Ligand binder design. Structure first.
Ligand code: VEL
Lengths: 237, 300
């Protein structure tokens, strides 16, 4: 069934599962034509496929050439996502294939279900959670590899850096969703928080800065403040 | 013209014959139905006055034998039976017709409704959907479930309709996932018409039979099957032109004949709104769309 507040700890049990977010697959800039009409120009996108227990991220880069001469792209984007996720599963060894795939948007249910007909035992699930994975392109290293790609490409990351050496998956996922929720509501402020102290660096093999445990508590506090305010600065409270 | 005689009528019951029906009182001297038009299948059906639960009935074709009804007080229903002895049966029917103990199949000569609802329905195909080879006629009731319903429990009493499932490997060509799910022509024309049904006549016959079992018995699995078979055609961008014109006529007479007060359960909103207004064939069902709009615009 659907994933929500009440069955949240299932994410961190020992059944392999992936989140699939398609919000950054088909990306456009909308502009004006010489005649004064409006046209879109596509830029590179990505499928955000995440193991919430391990932090393994399968970032399938979607090159703009995919869209050449295609119609109804926003519809095609959902089917292209499902084709690539199915290809990813088929590429994994059987003991690594997920038992569940949770789509962050319900319009991915039928496209993924049809592409996974070969996998009757893999459950395709929606979610009632409003997860902030659209903000993944606010992580500089992920944005950089997507924009520089010249062809279709899969890039593997651990979105938790080394956090699982010190914290649980539940705690790591909560930190991740707090960081992304902050980048989503006010990117500039979120990014200022993460970089204010020049002495804390991002390791070459990491996505996020190398905070001590005490510094993460301060950072996480600052991100909460931001999210509440922007919710005040929005609804005035 | 043929005749289906009744030994007796021991319990109060509403008897239908095709789209007609009449009330028979307990132990009323009712001995059958005469002037039944030859050349069509027919359905005789029953709703007891005391247990509106269980509508049930018999599909038959008077060319295939001499059939009659007798109340079984053990099993508690009107049963159809076949009479081997041809002059014993002609004796029975004549003696009855002389005592004028039979109702007349009340067809208006202008009226082609039954023909139009049963145009492609053949007994041979019915007998394959309702499996019971020791009888020339076929029993159906409100509660029987379909093969596909059983999959998702007594197979002897199943309706073995052709299984249609839009998110199935039979329906979706590997590599054409999006193409086949959004345009079902492959599944319609190659898988179902060419492969399973062989021709559109046998497809239309199963469609018509499912509708009639939904209407006369309130059979839910049959209603599901009727809607599925409509949706497969309307969701195909490529349908033979003769099929589309004929589908319009078929659906027209089904909606025309449906009880105005049963449209809440026997009609599926999603299927009809997609078929008349969103699908490839939104413009190829003028007669059906016209009568649906003037008679069920709430649904839409
Ligand atoms: O005893 C077998 C038999 C009984 C009655 C018949 O007519 C019935 F329709 F009224 C025909 C055959």
């Amino acid at each position: 069934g659907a994933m929500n507040s009440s069955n949240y700890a299932e994410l961190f049990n020992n059944d392999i599962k992936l989140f699939v977010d398609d919000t950054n697959v088909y990306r456009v800039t909308v502009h004006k034509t010489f005649e004064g009409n409006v046209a879109t120009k596509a830029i590179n996108g990505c499928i955000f496929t995440l193991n919430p227990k391990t932090g393994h991220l399968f970032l399938k880069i979607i090159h703009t050439s995919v869209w050449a001469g295609q119609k109804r792209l926003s519809q095609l984007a959902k089917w292209k996502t499902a084709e690539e996720v199915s290809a990813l599963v088929r590429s994994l060894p059987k003991e690594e294939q997920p038992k569940q795939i949770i789509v962050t948007r319900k319009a991915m249910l039928d496209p993924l279900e049809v592409h996974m007909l070969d996998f009757p035992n893999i459950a395709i699930r929606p979610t009632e959670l409003r997860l902030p994975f659209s903000a993944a392109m606010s992580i500089d290293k992920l944005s950089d590899v997507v924009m520089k790609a010249t062809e279709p490409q899969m890039v593997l990351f651990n979105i938790y850096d080394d956090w699982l050496d010190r914290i649980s998956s539940y705690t790591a996922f909560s930190r991740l969703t707090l960081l992304l929720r902050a980048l989503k509501t006010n990117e500039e402020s979120a990014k200022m928080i993460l970089l204010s102290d020049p002495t804390i660096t991002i390791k070459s093999y990491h996505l996020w800065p190398s905070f001590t445990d005490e510094q993460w508590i301060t950072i996480e506090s600052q991100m909460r403040d931001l999210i509440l305010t922007e919710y005040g600065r929005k609804y005035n409270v | 013209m043929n005749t289906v005689p009744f030994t007796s009528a021991p319990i109060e019951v509403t008897i239908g014959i095709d789209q007609y029906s009449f009330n028979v009182k307990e132990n009323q001297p009712f001995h059958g139905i005469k002037d039944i038009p030859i050349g069509h299948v027919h359905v005789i059906h029953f709703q007891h006055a005391d247990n509106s639960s269980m509508r049930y009935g018999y599909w038959f074709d008077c060319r295939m034998g001499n059939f009659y009804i007798q109340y079984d007080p053990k099993d508690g229903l009107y049963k159809m039976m076949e009479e081997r002895d041809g002059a014993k049966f002609e004796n029975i029917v004549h003696n009855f017709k002389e005592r004028q103990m039979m109702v007349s199949y009340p067809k208006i000569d202008e009226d082609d409704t039954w023909y139009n609802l049963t145009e492609f329905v053949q007994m041979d195909k019915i007998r394959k959907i309702v499996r019971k080879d020791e009888n020339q006629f076929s029993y159906v009731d409100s509660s029987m479930t379909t093969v596909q319903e059983n999959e998702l429990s007594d197979p002897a009493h199943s309706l073995n309709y052709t299984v249609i499932n839009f998110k199935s490997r039979e329906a979706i060509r590997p590599g054409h996932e999006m193409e086949d799910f959004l345009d079902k022509s492959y599944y319609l024309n190659t898988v179902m018409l060419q492969g399973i049904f062989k021709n559109s006549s046998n497809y239309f016959g199963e469609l018509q039979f499912a509708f009639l079992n939904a209407m006369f018995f309130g059979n839910y699995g049959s209603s599901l099957q009727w809607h599925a078979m409509i949706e497969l055609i309307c969701s195909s961008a490529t349908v033979p032109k003769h099929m589309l014109d004929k589908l319009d006529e078929i659906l027209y007479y089904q909606i025309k004949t449906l009880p105005e007060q049963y449209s809440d359960i026997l009609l599926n909103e999603r299927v009809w709104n997609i078929c008349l207004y969103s699908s490839f064939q939104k413009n190829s069902l003028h007669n059906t769309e016209k009568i649906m709009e003037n008679k069920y615009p709430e649904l839409l």
